[PDB]
Amino acid sequence: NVETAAELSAVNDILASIGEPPVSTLEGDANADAANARRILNKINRQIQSRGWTFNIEEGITLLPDVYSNLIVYSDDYLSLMSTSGQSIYVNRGGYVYDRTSQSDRFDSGITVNIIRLRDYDEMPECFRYWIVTKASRQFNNRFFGAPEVEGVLQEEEDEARRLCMEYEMDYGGYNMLDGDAFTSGLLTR
């Protein structure tokens, strides 16, 4: 891809656990350590935005099919997509979203989806940046530099980072039991 000013610091902090800083990562056939850690970084990104957080879940989004092909396109950018209310009826098939109850693929009008879109190492809160850096550091530890004690401390410190990031999520978007949900909103109408 393209160099990013914060992503180089991420790949550097992966190698902060083991060894030396690389520079700028902008070559395919290159420093194998940097490109390898960059792959681990993007994998932990694509996994850490998979779990569902309340800034990533774009709620009422509308997708539109192509006018010629009449066929709305699932993507690898579309990380995990579900329907709005319940008993979601959309699934990927060929690379295209598909109804499993209407038994059809061609859509006339648009479609309303709760979708997760894949974002970068940037466009994320610093809580989640520290958590992707620490979990990818644990993976990079376990797969190349197999030392036991640094694995123990990165496991403990991953748990602390996830603790902070759950605190960020329950502080982002205050969820009150009795005045904000769908069932016991109507029970307390006088």
Add this chain to the structure above:
Amino acid sequence: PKEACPYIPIRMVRLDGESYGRSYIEEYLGDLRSLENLQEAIVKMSMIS
């Protein structure tokens, strides 16, 4: 005449140098409202159940 005034203004609890009256519920309003809150919750806390 002074004594046979057909407009009769009635006060419940009188106070000195004050043209109107204060209700009897006023004097026990606060423990009334402290009941209100304390009771309100309970109903709300029931609904969570």
